[PDB]
Design a binder for these strands. Structure first.
Lengths: 729, 729
DNA sequence: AGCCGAGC
DNA sequence: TGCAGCTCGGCT
DNA sequence: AGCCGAGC
DNA sequence: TGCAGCTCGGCT
C-alpha cells in the first residue's frame, strides 16, 4: 500500500478478507509482540497495525479534524471502510479487506481508554459492523504467579489480590513490552483464552458508549463517577471485594459491561492523576517528583532526564518518562503566569513568557534541584506525621504533604479529568501568610484577589469567581502608545502575531488600525511602542485603549474541584472555603508535631539520663563492667534502674498506634565510646543532658500556633532573600 | 546566499568585498560567540560561518571526495573562490566576496588541528592568497586570573603555569562555549590583541605545511615527533620551561612557527590519546572510564549516557561526551572479533557481528556495569602502588593500572595517531595465563598465535607478523556447500552483500557463479548454504573453496607501537617482546604488593597489640582513665608503653616516600566501644590480635610469584564460571 | 576504496 | 549539544 | 477555535 | 521508548 508501520495479512483484500483480523496495538513494541506472537503461520489472516497513543474522539469532532486525522484515515484504508456505508448484505461486505478488528492494549486503565475510543469510532460510524461482532480484544495478564511447576495469569489486580486468599514467584506486566517473544507465542497459541468478543446486547450498550464519549453527557458522567466513588468507598468500608472482569471462562463482553466496569476505572484513575489535592496542591506525579527530591537531597543540579529516571525508580511511577520530564519542567518554571513559588530551580532554559514556556530546551540538556524554599514550606519534621503509601512492598510518596501555607492557591492548580476539571488561579504568598496569621490570632480571614508574581497589571473582581485581568497601556504623545504589560498568560509572541500584526496589516473584515510598532522586550518583560494617526489614536482612547488593543481578559473560577484530606472529590465555591479547610487541618497537624516532638525529645532526654547516670556511676565506681558478660550485665542492668533504649523504645511505640490504623537493649550506653569517661567528655554529657531537659520544657511552653508562627517567620525571611536575589539578575 | 548556517557580512560581495573578513568557527557555539561578540556594528565587514569539526585534508584527497565535500564547497561559495585561479592582479581579485578568512577555534590542540587543515586547504589551492596575508586567527584565553581590580588572560597553559610571580581567582576555558556574551564583546572590542596574522616567510613555510599534511611525509613526521618528544624529555628533565606561543605583543605568526610550535602539540597529544600503553592496554579515555567504574562500584546497571557524564566529572575528561559513550560501547562489546574479555557488560544491544557492532542502540537506551572479571584482572589491592594523576587539584585516573595479565594482548589494542599507528590482534587469555605460569617457573614462554574468543576458523603463521585467517566451508553434496565461519572481522551482512550477492547475480566483469543461497544465522553464528551446478562446484574445490568464496584474509602486524612503562613510544617487533617487558614490571609490582601488605598488616598487628595490652590493663586495673584529662593521658599513655596509631603512623609515613617522587594520636584505643571490656571482647581481641600476627607470618613466608599464582588461579576460576554461563544463553 | 576509533 | 563527514597510519 | 497538562 | 496528535472540562 503506502502505510509504513502496517504489516498486512497476506490474505487481506483477497477472497478470505472476511476471515481476516486486523490487530490494532497500543504502540510499536505491542506490534512487535503481536508479530512474533503470530509467527510465520499467523501472517495469512492476521494483520498488525500500531496506533501511537490516544486517538481522536470522533463522536462530536469537527468534520475538518476528522478528515485530517492520519491515524483514523490509515485504519479506514487498511480495513477498507467507507463512511456513511452500511455493511449488511453480501455486496456491502465485498469491499472490506478485513472481517474483524482485534484490539491489543496494555492491561491497564489507559489501554481500556484506547479500546473505548476505538469502540466509540466504530459505534458512531458503522453500527451495522458493531452490532455483528466486528470488534474483539486480545487480553494479556497484568500479574503472573509461578509456584514451581504451574504458572498463573491474572488479568486484573483485584483478581490477583483476592487469589492471595489461598496461601509463589510473582512477576508484574506493566505494559505489553514486558512480555518476551516466547511469552507472546504462548499467548497466541492459547487464542481461546485471550480472545474476548465484544457482544452488542441492546440499547443499553448505545447508552453506555454515549455516556462515556459524548460531549453532551458531562453531567451524566459526573453522576456516573459519583456513584462509583461512593459505592467503591462502601465496599471498601464493609471489607467487600472489588469486582474484576476476566476471571471467568466467558469469552464475551457486552459494550455496557465494558464501559461500566472497565472504562470507568480509567475515568476514575484519570481524575486521581489530574485533579490536585486541597492539602498540598499536588497531583500524584508531582508529589512523587518531590518525594524523590526530598529523598536524594541533592546539593547540586541534576539533569532533568536523569531525575525522571530516578523518580520513576525511587517512587514507583509506572508511566512514560517524557510526561514525568514535562511535569518536572512545569514544576520549575518561574516566568510571569506560571508558578508564584517554583519548588524546583530552573537551571537552564525551562521556557519564557515569550512562548508560554513552549521554548523550553530538551530535558536531556537542562538541570534542576530543590529551591531553598521547598523544605521551608514542607518541613521535614512533619514527615513523621504523614501516611506513606506502598507500591508492592516499596514505601513511596505520602498520600499528601502538609505544607505551612495552602500551596494549592500559590501556584494555581489545574487539571482536566473525566466528569470534572480543576482551575485555580495564583494567589500572593505574603497575602496568604498574613491571612494565616490573622486566623491564628482568632480573626476572620480577609478576602483575597488572584495575584501573579511579577505581574504589573491589575486584577479586579467582576462578580463571584469572575475577574477582569488587564495589562498596561499608556498614551505617550498624540501618535504613540506604549504597552508594558500583557494580561496574565497572554504570551508575547502570540499577542504580536494575533493582535499587533492584524492591526498593522488590516484584514478582510477590517482595515489597518496602526501605522507602525517596535519591540523592546527583555526575557521577562514586555515593551511595545505603537504608532498611529492622531485621529485613530483619539478614537482608540475614546473607545478605551485596553479594549482596542485586547489587553483585557476574563478569568472565571466556577470549577474549583479538589480532593479533600480524605480523598473525596469536592467542589469549593470560594477560595476562602479552601483556605479555611486547609487551615483547620494544618493547625491540627501542628498539634501532633508538638506532641510528636514532646515524645522524641523526652526519649532523647530519658536516653541522655541513663547514658548519664551510668557514666558518672562508673566515674566513682558503683557498678563494674570490666570482664563481665553480656548475659550477666543485661540482667545486672535491668536489676538496677536502667532502661532499654528509650529512643528505640519510643519509635517502636508510636508505630503501634499506626499498627492499628488502616529483648532488652542497653546498647546506647554500651556502644558509647570508651572516651565517654574523661572529665572533658563527662561534663559535656551533663550539659547535653541538662540542655535536653530544657529542650523539652522550652517546647512544653509553646502552643502549636507558636510553632506555626515560627515556621511562617522563617519562610518569609527566606522568601525575601530568594525573591530579591531573583530581581538582581 | 543559499547556505543555512552562514551569516554573511552585509558588505560581502559588494564593492568593499576585499575589506570583508569571513570568520570560520569551530562549531555552532563559537559562531554564536562570534555574532554576539561582533554586535550590530560588526555585521558590515565580518561574516561568520561554522564548520562542524575536522575537515577534509585536500592535499592528496581524491578528486571525487574533494568535489563532493559540502563544507569545503560552502567555504568556496561564501568566499567566492575558484579552483586553479591565481589571485594577483586587480581583475582576479574582483571576483572575491571576502578579503581574508579569520579562524576562530578553541584554544586547544584540536583547534590547532582545524587551523592547520584550513591553512593546508588554502596553501594547496591558492598559494597567491596564502603568501599575501589572506589568513588570520582570533585567539582567546584558555586560563583567566582575576585579582580584584585587574583581570589576566593566558593563551596557553604553559604560560599560565609559568608564572612564579606569586603573592587570584582562576577560571578555565575548556572551549569557546565557556565565554559569555559580555566576554565576547570584550574580545572583539580588543581586536588588536586577539587578531593574529599568519605571515608567509619563505620555503620553510611550505616545507612545514607539507610536513604536517602530505601523505608522502609519514617518515618525516616520525622524525619530527621523535625530536619533539626527546627534546621535551630534556627540557623537562633539567626543569626548564616549555616555550609557549602567545605571550608577546607580536601580532604575526609564520606558518613554520605555527606548524612547529602549535600544530606539533596536537600531533603529540593525538598519539597520547590514540596509542595504547603496554602496561594495561588502555588509552587515556578508556582508563578514565574504568577508573570511574572502580570508584562508583556500581552493584547495578547504569545507562551508558549517564555513566559518560559521571566519567567526565569524576575523572576530568575534557572532550565531547558522544565520543566517551562510543568508548564505553567499544569496551563492552563481546561479539566475535571484538573483545576477548569485555571489562564492561553489554546490558542491551551493543552491536552484533552481523554489522560489526554498528547496529548498537543509542547510549541513552543501553546499560552497563563492571564485569565480575574486572577487579580480578586489576586487583584493588594494587591501586596502593599506582601513580594517580592530577587535573587541576583533582586526583583522577592513574598513569596505568598494571593488570595480572597483559591486557594489551587480550583485546587487541589499536589506534591511529600522527606519525605512528598501533595494531595488536587478540590473544587467548588462557594461553597467556599459561605463558605467565611458565615464566614464573623459570621457563621460556611459548610463541603465541592470535586467537579470538568463539572464532571457529583457523589462524596460521605465514612469516613474521603475517597470518592467514580463514573461515569454514564444507562440501555437503555435488551441488551444495556450507559456510559456517567467516574470517575474523568479516561481518555477516558485508560478506553477504559483497561476496554472495555478486556470485549469485554476476557482474559486468564476471558472470554468475552460484545458483542459490540461503541464510541460517543466529545473533552470534554464521550459516550460509550455497547451491551450485555440479560442474561449477567442481571447479571451485579444484581452485580451492576458501579462495573462491573469499574466506581468507591476511593479518599483518608490523606496527605494534606502544607506550612503555616510562611513557616512551616503542615499536615491538614481536608479541613475545611485549610479554617479557610486561612480565618484568608485573613481577616487580607483586614484590611491592608483598612489601606493602607486610608493612600495612604489621601496622594493623602493632595496632591490635596496643589495643590489646590496653584492655587487659584496666581489666585487672593497671591504668585508670575514669575522669582524667586529654592533657593528662596523652602524656600519661605516652609516658608508659603505648604507641600512637600505627596504621595512621604507617600511612602518613609511607606518604613521604612518594612525597620524594614528584601530635600523638591514641584515638584508636579510646574511640573503642565501651564493650571492649567484656568476656567476649577480650578473647575476641586475642584471637584477632593473634590472627593478625599469623596474617603477617603466612604472608611473610609467601613469595611474590606465590601471590601472582594465587591471582591467576582466582581469575581462571571466574573466567570458567563466566564463560560457560555466557555459553548457556 | 575503505576499515579500525578517539577526536571535533 | 552534537551534527556529519572528516583525521591520522597501516594494512586489505 | 484553542489553551491548560498528565497521560499514551 | 517515544513519536504526534490526541483526551478530558471549563472557560475564552
Amino acid at each position: 500500500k503506502g502505510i509504513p508501520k502496517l504489516d498486512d495479512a497476506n490474505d487481506a483484500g483477497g477472497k478470505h478478507s472476511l476471515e481476516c483480523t486486523l490487530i490494532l496495538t497500543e504502540g510499536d513494541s505491542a506490534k512487535s509482540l503481536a508479530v512474533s506472537g503470530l509467527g510465520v503461520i499467523g501472517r495469512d489472516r492476521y494483520g498488525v497495525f500500531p496506533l501511537r497513543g490516544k486517538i481522536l474522539n470522533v463522536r462530536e469532532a469537527s468534520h475538518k479534524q476528522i478528515m485530517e486525522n492520519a491515524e483514523i484515515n490509515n485504519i479506514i484504508k487498511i480495513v477498507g471502510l467507507q463512511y456513511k456505508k452500511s455493511y449488511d448484505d453480501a455486496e456491502s461486505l465485498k469491499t472490506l479487506r478485513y472481517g474483524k478488528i482485534m484490539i491489543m492494549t496494555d492491561q491497564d486503565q489507559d489501554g481500556s481508554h484506547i479500546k473505548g475510543l476505538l469502540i466509540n469510532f466504530i459505534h458512531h460510524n458503522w453500527p451495522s459492523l458493531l452490532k455483528h461482532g466486528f470488534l474483539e480484544e486480545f487480553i494479556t495478564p497484568i500479574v503472573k504467579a509461578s509456584k514451581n511447576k504451574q504458572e498463573l495469569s491474572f488479568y486484573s489486580i483485584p483478581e490477583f489480590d483476592e487469589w492471595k486468599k489461598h496461601i509463589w514467584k510473582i512477576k508484574y506486566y506493566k505494559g505489553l513490552g514486558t512480555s518476551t517473544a516466547k511469552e507472546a507465542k504462548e499467548y497466541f497459541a492459547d487464542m481461546e483464552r485471550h480472545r474476548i468478543l465484544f457482544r452488542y446486547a441492546g440499547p443499553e450498550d448505545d447508552a453506555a458508549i454515549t455516556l462515556a464519549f459524548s460531549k453532551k453527557k458531562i453531567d451524566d458522567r459526573k453522576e456516573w463517577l459519583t456513584n462509583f466513588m461512593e459505592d467503591r468507598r462502601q465496599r471498601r468500608l464493609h471489607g467487600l471485594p472489588e469486582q474484576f472482569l476476566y476471571g471467568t471462562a466467558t469469552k464475551h463482553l457486552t459494550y455496557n459491561d465494558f464501559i461500566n466496569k472497565e472504562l470507568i476505572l480509567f475515568s476514575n484513575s484519570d481524575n486521581e492523576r489530574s485533579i490536585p489535592s486541597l492539602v498540598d496542591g499536588f497531583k500524584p506525579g508531582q508529589r512523587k517528583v518531590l518525594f524523590t527530591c526530598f529523598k536524594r537531597n541533592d546539593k547540586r543540579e541534576v539533569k532533568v532526564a536523569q531525575l525522571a529516571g530516578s523518580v520513576a525508580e525511587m517512587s514507583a511511577y509506572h508511566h512514560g518518562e517524557q510526561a514525568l520530564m514535562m511535569t518536572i519542567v512545569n514544576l520549575a518554571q518561574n516566568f510571569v503566569g506560571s508558578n508564584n513559588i517554583n519548588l524546583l530551580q530552573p537551571i537552564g532554559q525551562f521556557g519564557t513568557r515569550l512562548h508560554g514556556g513552549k521554548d523550553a530546551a530538551s530535558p536531556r540538556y537542562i538541570f534542576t534541584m530543590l529551591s531553598t524554599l521547598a523544605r521551608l514550606l514542607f518541613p521535614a519534621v512533619d514527615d513523621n506525621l504523614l501516611k506513606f503509601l506502598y507500591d508492592d512492598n516499596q514505601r513511596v510518596e505520602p498520600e499528601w504533604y502538609i505544607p505551612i501555607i495552602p500551596m494549592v492557591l500559590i501556584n494555581g492548580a489545574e487539571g482536566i479529568g473525566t466528569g470534572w476539571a480543576c482551575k485555580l488561579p495564583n494567589y500572593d504568598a505574603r497575602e496568604i501568610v498574613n491571612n494565616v496569621r490573622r486566623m491564628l490570632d482568632g480573626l476572620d480571614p480577609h478576602p483575597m484577589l488572584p495575584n501573579y508574581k511579577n505581574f504589573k497589571g491589575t486584577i479586579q473582581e467582576l462578580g463571584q469567581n469572575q475577574y477582569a485581568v488587564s495589562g498596561e497601556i499608556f498614551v505617550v504623545d498624540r501618535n504613540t502608545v506604549e504597552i508594558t504589560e500583557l494580561p496574565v498568560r497572554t504570551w508575547t509572541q502570540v499577542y504580536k502575531e494575533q493582535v499587533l500584526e492584524p492591526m498593522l496589516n488590516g484584514t478582510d473584515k477590517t482595515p489597518a488600525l496602526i501605522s507602525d510598532y517596535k519591540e523592546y522586550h527583555t526575557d521577562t518583560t514586555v515593551k511595545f511602542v505603537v504608532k498611529m494617526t492622531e485621529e485613530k489614536l483619539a478614537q482608540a482612547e475614546a473607545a478605551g485603549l485596553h479594549k482596542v488593543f485586547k489587553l483585557q481578559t476574563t478569568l472565571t473560577c466556577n470549577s474549583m474541584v479538589l480532593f479533600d484530606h480524605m480523598g473525596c472529590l469536592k467542589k469549593y465555591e470560594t477560595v476562602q472555603d479552601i483556605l479555611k479547610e486547609f487551615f483547620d487541618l494544618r493547625l491540627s497537624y501542628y498539634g501532633l508535631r508538638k506532641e510528636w516532638l514532646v515524645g522524641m525529645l523526652g526519649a532523647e532526654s530519658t536516653k541522655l539520663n541513663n547514658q548519664a547516670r551510668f557514666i558518672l556511676e562508673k566515674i566513682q565506681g558503683k557498678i563494674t563492667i570490666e570482664n563481665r558478660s553480656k548475659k550477666d550485665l543485661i540482667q545486672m542492668l535491668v536489676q538496677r534502674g536502667y532502661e532499654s533504649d528509650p529512643v528505640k523504645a519510643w519509635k517502636e511505640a508510636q508505630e503501634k498506634a499506626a499498627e492499628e490504623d488502616e529483648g532488652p537493649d542497653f546498647n546506647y550506653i554500651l556502644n558509647m565510646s570508651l572516651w565517654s569517661l574523661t572529665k572533658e567528655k563527662v561534663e559535656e554529657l551533663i550539659k547535653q543532658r541538662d540542655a535536653k531537659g530544657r529542650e523539652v520544657n522550652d517546647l512544653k511552653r509553646k502552643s502549636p500556633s507558636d510553632l506555626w508562627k515560627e515556621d511562617l517567620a522563617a519562610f518569609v525571611e527566606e522568601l525575601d532573600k530568594v525573591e530579591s536575589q531573583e530581581r538582581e539578575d
